[PDB]
Design a protein around this ligand. Sequence first.
Ligand code: A1BCT
Ligand code: A1BCT
Lengths: 131, 123
Amino acid sequence: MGNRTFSYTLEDHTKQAFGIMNELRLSQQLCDVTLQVKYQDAPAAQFMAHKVVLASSSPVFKAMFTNGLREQGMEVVSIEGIHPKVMERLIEFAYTASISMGEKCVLHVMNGAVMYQIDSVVRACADFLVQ
Amino acid sequence: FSYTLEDHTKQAFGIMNELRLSQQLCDVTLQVKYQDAPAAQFMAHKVVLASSSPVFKAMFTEQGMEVVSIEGIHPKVMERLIEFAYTASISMGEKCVLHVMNGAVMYQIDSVVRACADFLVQQ
Ligand SMILES: *CCC(=O)N1CCOC[C@H]1c1cc(Cl)cc(-c2ncnc(N)n2)c1
Ligand SMILES: *CCC(=O)N1CCOC[C@H]1c1cc(Cl)cc(-c2ncnc(N)n2)c1
């Protein structure tokens, strides 16, 4: 009584939500950006995604997408300086909160994570290197 | 090795909520008309609303900003549901729990329905 308002956090929710966002990415629905990842004259690799989700993972993505002006349809964004396999895992991280690596690719991933200022991935890579 | 950063989705939602409140990257405007109350507009991200509700997901699955009209749900309810989608938290009280529950039912947001029922039964 007394017009008091109560708040309730639903603890399973953000994990289920990200799962749905990842599903939509993989079925290429609602996406508004296509990344064209050109590295060292390999053929360009394409990844579709949602700007709001990439921005939520990376201050670099957030600045890129919120700063200028385009046609507010599907934007094709040229990306250089990072291997597509690295960018693939950084996108997967933004949508899953998980990242996989091996001895042969941890430095690659760390380098990408530094470049996109994904601090939590940088720290996971560090953890991996030291063990 | 595989890592899961257990705090990440909470932090990400924080940022998406910030972008919603600053009206950045939004691709849907909900125009909500109820009874005699003033019309309200809510800008959001279709992918985030879809993440919260099978009804929003079906609704959206067009290019650019889409203006979508909704009738027969009070703007304050819709506002609570949007806030939930971006925070994982729902607010209610004695005099609006049925209204929030109705909204959650309509949008098939089962977690929120259950939280409303829990609240109602506690009274
Ligand atoms: C850990 C190694 C690994 O799993 N893979 C997957 C299959 O492709 C090769 C290899 C890999 C993974 C990543 Cl994330 C990056 C790279 C890579 N190779 C060369 N140059 C760069 N910049 N990255 C290989
Ligand atoms: C719990 C009651 C409450 O917190 N509020 C918030 C401030 O506005 C008044 C009141 C409220 C909240 C909600 Cl979610 C809905 C309504 C409402 N009033 C009339 N008709 C409808 N459909 N909803 C009031």
